[PDB]
Design a protein around this ligand. Structure first.
Ligand SMILES: *[C@@H]1O[C@H](CO)[C@@H](O)[C@H](O)[C@H]1NC(C)=O
Lengths: 50, 44
């Protein structure tokens, strides 16, 4: 019963629901990975693509 | 679950035969289809 004269609660809301599933197939979506700058000619630990 | 393809191209000038020689194939692509394949057919 929406009308323009409304208060805090009796307002129309949009809802979007996300859902996910697991399977033996390969993964298709993931969050991105952060990466440092590169220092050179120094003794350091390193991680390149794992 | 990954389907992988390899390929190469070369010129030949010979008839009704595979010419004797040696080559190696670079990788091209793979696809995450994960669909078991049992049969295939070629189109012309
Ligand atoms: C792979 O074969 C199995 C047989 O147990 C079948 O259940 C499954 O549907 C097949 N994969 C696809 C993508 O159809």
């Amino acid at each position: 019963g929406f009308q323009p004269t409304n208060g805090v609660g009796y307002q129309p809301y949009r809802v979007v629901v996300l859902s996910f599933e697991l399977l033996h197939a390969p993964a298709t979506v993931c969050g991105p990975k952060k990466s440092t700058n590169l220092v050179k000619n120094k003794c350091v630990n390193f991680n390149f693509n794992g | 679950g990954y389907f992988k393809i390899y390929s190469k191209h070369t010129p030949i000038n010979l008839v009704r035969d595979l010419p004797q020689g040696f080559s190696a194939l670079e990788p091209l692509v793979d696809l995450p289809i994960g669909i078991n394949i049992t049969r295939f057919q070629t189109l012309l």
